[PDB]
């Protein structure tokens, strides 16, 4: 009882974009920075290209394609968009370029210059992005600060849909078997029974917010991952970050209740944080908050992917 996915998957030629730099590298493959020029259009689009390392199992190619499947069927201002894929002797994914990169990396290198207005704004945008995912009945299953990218300091997007699995019309929960998982971000439901729902994503939202509020601290640092299940069962949670009013921390704690029903909805999270974003100083106490402020390659035909539509 669900609607046809009429999303368009676009196939891009090798000649159609220019690799200009290297961002990150791995055995799986490396990430390039470059410009995407669909010629005949007279436009250059800054993209992040993830070029496969041709030393790959068939199984590896697939995992990316399913993420590519997921990314192509989403259209939200706060969800990272897929531009297309290139079937070279190695399948590479072309996505919009996020110059400031990881939000987790961003808060850590700018701890000195991040104000309450920004922190609260991000919370709203992520809740907005996650809510879209709920409307499209999808579960991210890996919501973390490391998986939120920064287009501009005022605009962040959700990414990393490798573990993002969708539910059909009559589903509420569904199980997985194994593989390496982010224990510290996961609800108790998921650790004990491998059960992932939208409310399990609400948990990871609270952890993600806690990451931002602590300016990139590690949840349950020092504590081995083995003890997490046991500790949460004892009723222990993450400590209240110093800059947080009780109002903000109250909301985080709500994301961490054993009863998933008791947890807030993303639509509810948008409302509360939006309330707080109107009066940022009342809800986050940061030193020098009053004076904080935050911020190339031929760039005349440059358009950003968001302004480029099909």
């Amino acid at each position: 009882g669900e609607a046809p996915n009429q999303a368009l998957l676009r196939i891009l030629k090798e000649t159609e974009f220019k690799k200009i730099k290297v961002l990150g590298s791995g055995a799986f493959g490396t990430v390039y920075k470059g410009l995407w020029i669909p010629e005949g259009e007279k436009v250059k689009i800054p993209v992040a290209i993830k070029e496969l390392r041709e030393a790959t199992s068939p199984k590896a190619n697939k995992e990316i394609l399913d993420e590519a499947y997921v990314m192509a069927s989403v259209d939200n201002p706060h969800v990272c968009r897929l531009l297309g894929i290139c079937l070279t002797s190695t399948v590479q994914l072309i996505t919009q370029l996020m110059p400031f990169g990881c939000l987790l990396d961003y808060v850590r290198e700018h701890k000195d210059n991040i104000g309450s207005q920004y922190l609260l704004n991000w919370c709203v945008q992520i809740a907005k992005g996650m809510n879209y995912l709920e409307d499209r009945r999808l579960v991210h299953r890996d919501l973390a600060a490391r998986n939120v990218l920064v287009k501009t300091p005022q605009h962040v997007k959700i990414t990393d849909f490798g573990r993002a699995k969708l539910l059909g019309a009559e589903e509420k929960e569904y199980h997985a078997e194994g593989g390496k998982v982010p224990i510290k971000w996961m609800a108790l439901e998921s650790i004990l029974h491998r059960i992932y729902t939208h409310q399990s994503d609400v948990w990871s939202y609270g952890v993600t917010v806690w990451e931002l509020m602590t300016f990139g601290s590690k949840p349950y640092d020092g504590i081995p991952a083995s003890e997490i299940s046991s500790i949460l069962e004892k009723g222990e949670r993450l400590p209240q970050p110093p800059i947080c009013t009780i109002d903000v921390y109250m909301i985080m704690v709500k994301c961490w209740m054993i009863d998933a029903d008791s947890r807030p909805k993303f639509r509810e999270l948008i409302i509360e944080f939006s309330k707080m974003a109107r009066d940022p100083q009342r809800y986050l106490v940061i030193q020098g908050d009053e004076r904080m402020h935050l911020p190339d390659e031929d760039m005349d035909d440059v358009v950003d992917a968001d302004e480029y539509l099909i």
Binding site: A144, K180, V181, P182, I183, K184, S229
Partner: peptide, 7 residues
Amino acid sequence: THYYLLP
């Protein structure tokens, strides 16, 4: 270092 395989 954030992804583990528990039982």
